[PDB]
Amino acid sequence: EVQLLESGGGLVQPGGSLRLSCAASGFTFSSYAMSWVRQAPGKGLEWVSAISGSGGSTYYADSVKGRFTISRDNSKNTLYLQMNSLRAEDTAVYYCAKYDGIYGELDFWGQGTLVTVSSASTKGPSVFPLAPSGTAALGCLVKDYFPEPVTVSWNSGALTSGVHTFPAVLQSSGLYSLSSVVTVPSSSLGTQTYICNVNHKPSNTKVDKKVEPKSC
């Protein structure tokens, strides 16, 4: 199937540089023009740059001209974005996007890669139980981490029904925190084990937290 897999995003100092990659597959890469499109957290879509199928032609938004350089390697099936002199305003998820063969619209997008421009330090979360006391609620508090993102699953992905993993909020300390909760039958509390699987890849932090009613 048609696929665009971005990589290379992460935390970088303001004034620093970063190179994004996008691995294209399932189609003839050189046949199509390609694009980079960004989305700042909670904001709209902003077209960044486009490159012709051969690479002979390149275009940029005014906000990125002279700082960013789009390029491609048709033998490797790869699109690049070299980003220099980064600013806090360049913080965004960056999407690789394919143009239509003839018409010229963006008809396929990758999952995106997060770029965070900040002088703040990488820090792994601490994970605390939200212990339960028909239906009971329990959860995990994933506290004090930077940068985004964290992933949370329950019972290694076996439990998905009734799970709510909340958007992270930035605390005044400049660190993120989030909760993940699940509602379960109260009769399950004695028998069924509930473990939240937390992964903060940016800091190499993996935690499994078993959550049960607190003992008296």
Partner: protein, 220 residues
């Protein structure tokens, strides 16, 4: 640079009813040569990239249901979602691909208007492990409610707490069209151990009067 302006910013429509989103481009995107409008509509669900719905102002992409239809020409354009389904909750973007730079509208959030549903409320004391680190987080959960408006008040021994909590809300659920909300009250371990009664009080349209969930520190 062509400015794409969407209207409205936010839309709440009952399931099975019609949702219409307007898009106005500051220049005509109708290309004389082929008489086609260089206008596209995108759907973006939370956590996902935009998905192309409509190109040529009116042409439906493969795999996109009949209920999505695009119309208009020149500067004025409309996305119509007939028979709105719960899974259609998303932000919708128009985009001109007439000339560089490619430009997008600001987005329109489509929310589902369903019946009122009261939150189920739960309070969580801080863990012993966290307390040892010098901090106490107290969490209140409001689960599966509609509409989104809700008021959470934290009280510690009768004193209303202000400035020391943060809230986060989920995106409207794709199946049941409800929201959930977590509020986290944060205090020092020292402050926490100076007080007894910790209470979350929830006000919501679905509740005949506010619901309070509480615990006494140290008590089973």
């Amino acid at each position: 640079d062509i400015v794409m302006t969407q209207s409205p910013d936010s839309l709440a429509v009952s399931l099975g009813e019609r949702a219409t989103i307007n898009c106005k481009s500051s220049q005509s995107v109708l290309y004389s040569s082929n008489n086609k409008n260089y206008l596209a509509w995108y759907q973006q669900k939370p956590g996902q990239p935009p998905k192309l719905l409509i190109y040529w102002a009116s042409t439906r992409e493969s795999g996109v249901p009949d209920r999505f239809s695009g119309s208009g020409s020149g500067t004025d354009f409309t996305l119509t979602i007939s028979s709105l389904q719960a899974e259609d909750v998303a932000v919708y973007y128009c985009q001109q691909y007439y000339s560089t730079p490619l430009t997008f509208g600001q987005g329109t959030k489509v929310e589902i208007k369903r019946t009122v549903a009261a939150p189920s409320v739960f309070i969580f004391p801080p863990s012993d492990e966290q307390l040892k680190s010098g901090t106490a987080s107290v969490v209140c959960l409001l689960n599966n409610f509609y509409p989104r408006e809700a008021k959470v008040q934290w009280k510690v021994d009768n004193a209303l707490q202000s400035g020391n909590s943060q809230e986060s809300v989920t995106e409207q659920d794709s199946k049941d069209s409800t929201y959930s909300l977590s509020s986290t009250l944060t205090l020092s371990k020292a402050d926490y151990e100076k007080h007894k009664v910790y209470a979350c009080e929830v006000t919501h349209q679905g509740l005949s009067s506010p619901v309070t969930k509480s615990f006494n520190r140290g008590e089973c």
